[model samples]
Target: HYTWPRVNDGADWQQVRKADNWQDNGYVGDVTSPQIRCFQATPSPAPSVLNTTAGSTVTYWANPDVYHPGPVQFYMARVPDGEDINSWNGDGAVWFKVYEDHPTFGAQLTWPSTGKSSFAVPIPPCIKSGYYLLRAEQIGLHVAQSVGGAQFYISCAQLSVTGGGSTEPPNKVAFPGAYSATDPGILINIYYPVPTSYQNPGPAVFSC
Candidate 1:
């Protein structure tokens, strides 16, 4: 009869050696020790605008040193709520189709080239005034010793976009954190001229 071994956290099968007939039977498997890793999304301090006539350009940096031989992908979409500048699930959503491919766009990097890197994305023509979201994903894979198999990992950034009329920037008092899931990660706090500057104060005072 054949029995299997229990797989636990922080198990490293690579160091284990085969023993007795069971190890040679090809029915045994191994697990690797768990390693703690972290991924984050960093965005530009100021929100950028997509040129009405000529599109805008967006750039950001990333570090992939933790796990070499991993894949990465970037994503952008319109923000959903009018009140919330960073909300991702907005109406009339559109994606930059051209950036869907390319290693610079969404390709896995080899082990040797893993480390801090930069990426740039162009806001193509046709993106009207509104808010948007930008993010990234990281994937990992492992090749089976006896058979070919794979695994995956993912990560993303807290970013967003805005268009149409400019709005007040979020204040730290009103909006506590730099990033918020309730709104698009990017707050479009551009200053606009209103007819009355000192007439009546708004309903509520919000902070970033």
Candidate 2:
């Protein structure tokens, strides 16, 4: 399970949506399916919403650990006006990437998130005030040499952000549309000749 917290150790699903396969560490291989959105079979609201200050850091924890070799990325969608974050299903072209992990391409392959349990990213200080669905995704590329070989372990944390600026994020992309099965980053050989460089899938990161 991927957990969000300020501390290194925090409870899973506390302010995050509980995945249907929460205990399984399951992944989605089909990039076009709706499951790519949140990986929740019965998509439901999380028990709570974290009240966070814009630009502050939030740590995402992976239970057991991130056992695969892949880059970890983060995206977020603001809950529409008049919509309740508790019941809002993150759909449409509302997501804007906030972070994408970079990989060190060398003799072998090494993504910053490989084999780690947690990651931290700051809430953009430029985003406007709102309740948002904060998403965390890790694309497992160990078997990504083929189409559909990429494994996506994902989760969404509910957040109510305050003290933000008026900058509107650009290039919003829907989850199911954000990636392609055969994108260079989604399908590649990290072994053999060894990759000289790596490109992270999804839209570019947004910042203040």
Candidate 3:
């Protein structure tokens, strides 16, 4: 009853979103030669995939309000025909954006800093059924300088999705290949340019 949804901030970000981009060696385009990934393909002890239905709303909690201001986003990856999830390397075009929490402020934009402990997003209707990894992310843009400056708070939860559909959306991009360091969406000085618009990386969000 006390752990934060995925982060378990109650124990101080003990083991949650930090697992998303974790790598021991620089394995991708965006996550290049400057740093080591956080947890490296292991999940903390939320223990495993959550159970949820297609098109239903699921709320992610933050134990307490999130410390930084940023956008919250979701993604899904379906397990392959004869593969094991725990051992899967997340290969191929296996991930797709399902929902994003991009709040509004008229022309300019602002991310919520307080008074909210949860983020709600819906699973796309008619999504293919199977074992999946449900991911959530918060892109902290406050100190975002150049490439590799932005901190990505991300995590993936095990999911056994029910209530099926036949849609296998296109443009599915793999994790290590999904983001590029120079992509306009990622490598920018949010302060100097004063961003007027933003698009989270990866292909367009999937639809039903």
Candidate 4:
């Protein structure tokens, strides 16, 4: 992403006579410079607990600003009994995948496809992970014309799996949907994970 070529005559050649009225105009431009490319994204370090004796693969580092192209959906949920207010199941029971990297606007995850950027997913046969809610969705093909405007900020990682050897007893929870700001119309944000430890101890319902 770098280019700068603007030449509209005025340097490198001059020498005329008869009062020198030279006007051999020219114009051929292309300007936009900044070159230094070498990227290797691997950012998913904060909430860790992945120990499998049979199957385990959770790789996610697709947040290079999310441009817009196609295929990028990963959702896994099974931590819902927070007091059970009818059990909020938005994407059906949960567990879904589709990420082999099918979008490219330029930050890495590249190979053929060209448009929306960043992607990587691999959480195969490794369930029973106590506390999981990793959601990511950026499926866009320009539905008539809303070509990318949902800004971008979808990241979640909280996986704790310890089954085969069982030493389970390290519950120190405060994991909740992090960071969100809304007011204009209000679309969900109930004092998010506030002063937490695990408080969905619920009583709030809304249905239509």
**TM-scores, in order shown?**
0.36, 0.93, 0.75, 0.23
Model 4 misplaced regions, further than 4 Å: 1-68, 77-102, 105-121, 124-128, 131-136, 141-208
Per-model root-mean-square deviation over C-alphas: 22.2, 2.0, 5.4, 23.6
lDDT to native, each model:
0.27, 0.81, 0.59, 0.27
Candidate number that wins on TM-score, 1 or 3: 3
The regions of model 2 sitting more than 4 angstroms off are: 1-10
Model 3 Cα lDDT, one tens digit per residue, 35-60:
11222354343344456788877666
Against the hidden true structure, what lDDT does model 1 obtain? 0.27
| Top candidate when judged by lDDT against the true structure | 2
Candidate 1 minimal-lDDT segment of 10 residues: 31-40
Q: Worst ten-residue run, lDDT, model 4?
A: 31-40
lDDT of 4 by residue, 1-208 (tens): 1111111121111100001101221111101100000010222222233333214444443323344433344544445435221222223223333233332323332323233333444443434434444444332332212222212223334343344232221222111222122311112211332212211111111111
Pairs clashing within candidate 4? 68-116, 104-115
Judge candidate 1 at residue 197 and give its lDDT.
15
Clashes of 2: 0
**Best TM-score among the predictions, by candidate number:** 2
Residue 122 C-alpha lDDT in model 3: 78
Candidate 1 or 4, higher TM-score? 1
- Give candidate 1's error at residue 125 in angstroms: 3.0
79-140: candidate 2 lDDT, tens digit per residue: 97799999998888999999888888677877787667768867998899999998888888
Give the Å error, residue 190, model 3.
2.8
